[PDB]
């Protein structure tokens, strides 16, 4: 059993107080809201319920730009999303916020990012080398320790907000619409995050957790692509979704997390848990994705998806594993 005051960050725990108030009080924060007509919508680009996304021309200038409509949400979610992406410009491997822009006739607020020329994981997955699949986990590594160190939790890490332009080997991580604030022994809303990538404190109600749920997500990506099996954990629903966890983690460290942070277990979970032992990572190895697995990346990838949140590796951690000493290496 521990601490009865609940989980408290590894690192970056203390970030938030050591600067302003106005740095995380986002209800305070005011945009400066443009005029969206300087911006032609070109082609809508895709996404789904919380928003759409069109590439455009900054008509100024000419600019390939994207444009991200934010469908009807609560001003406050708006505002977090905007200083979030205020508070993270500038930083390494995180998308560009261009503008704040709002239409004339019809108000509806968006926002302004920089073009990448991406290429859908779907596709990209599949011809990704070993050394392709380091440099790109490396490359989110360094966005996930910026906006950690930043004091940020980004809560929807998943391959659809990771855009990657193959041929200029550039990375961005985005949609910040559902990043927090972290602070010590707050609790958060678990209904974040795709249920493919949802860590097991969200699964089981446990609110109080960090930074290392974006570290959960990160290896159920870094599973899927050195075992070709996208997603790795291909859940039903949020029920499905643990017992999938926990047909490969085994059931007794799941049990084990829950009686170390006092967790109520859900009791339709009882049903539906049962028993299992935790698998050998080697099992999934076959002739199709062997070319892309290592001892070092079963190692790594066995210390990110734990479900002690606490245990997993921080994103400074996992970037001085062995598993990147050629990415590191090669400048
Ligand atoms: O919600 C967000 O925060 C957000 C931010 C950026 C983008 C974004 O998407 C792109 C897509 Cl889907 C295709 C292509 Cl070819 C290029 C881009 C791009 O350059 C780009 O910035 C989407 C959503
Ligand atoms: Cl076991």
């Avoid at 400066?32 to 300087?38: A, E, L, M, P, V």
């Avoid at 910040?176 to 609790?187: I, R």
């Avoid at 974040?192 to 949802?198: I, N």
Wanted: hydrophobic residues 35%; contains cysteine; charged residues 30%.
């Amino acid at each position: 059993p521990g601490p009865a005051a609940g989980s408290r960050a590894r690192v970056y725990a203390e970030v938030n107080s050591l600067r302003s108030r106005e740095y995380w009080d986002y209800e305070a924060h005011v945009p400066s809201w443009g005029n969206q007509d300087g911006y032609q919508l070109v082609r809508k680009l895709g996404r789904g319920k919380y928003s759409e996304v069109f590439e455009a021309i900054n008509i100024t200038n000419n600019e390939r730009v994207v444009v991200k409509i934010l469908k009807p949400v609560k001003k406050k979610k708006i505002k977090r999303e905007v200083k979030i992406l205020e508070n993270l410009r500038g930083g390494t491997n995180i998308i560009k916020l261009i503008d704040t822009v709002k239409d004339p006739v019809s108000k509806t607020p968006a926002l302004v990012f920089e073009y990448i020329n991406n290429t859908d994981f779907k596709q990209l997955y599949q011809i990704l080398t070993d050394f392709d699949i380091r440099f790109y986990m490396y490359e989110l590594l360094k966005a996930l320790d910026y906006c950690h160190s930043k004091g940020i939790m980004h809560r929807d890490v998943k391959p659809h907000n990771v855009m990657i332009d193959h041929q200029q080997k550039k990375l961005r991580l985005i949609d910040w619409g559902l990043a927090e604030f972290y602070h010590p022994a707050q609790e958060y809303n678990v209904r974040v995050a795709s249920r493919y990538f949802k860590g097991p404190e969200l699964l089981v109600d446990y609110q109080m957790y960090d930074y290392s749920l974006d570290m959960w997500s990160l290896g159920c990506m870094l599973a899927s692509m050195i075992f070709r099996r996208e997603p790795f954990f291909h859940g039903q629903d949020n029920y499905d979704q643990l017992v999938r966890i926990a047909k490969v983690l085994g059931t007794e460290e799941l049990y084990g997390y829950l009686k170390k942070y006092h967790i109520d277990l859900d009791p339709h979970f009882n049903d539906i848990l049962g028993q299992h032992s935790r698998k050998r990572w080697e099992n999934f190895i076959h002739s199709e994705n062997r070319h892309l697995v290592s001892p070092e990346a079963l190692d790594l990838l066995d210390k990110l998806l734990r479900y002690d949140h606490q245990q997993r590796l921080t994103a400074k951690e996992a970037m001085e594993h062995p598993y990147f000493y050629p990415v590191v290496k090669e400048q």
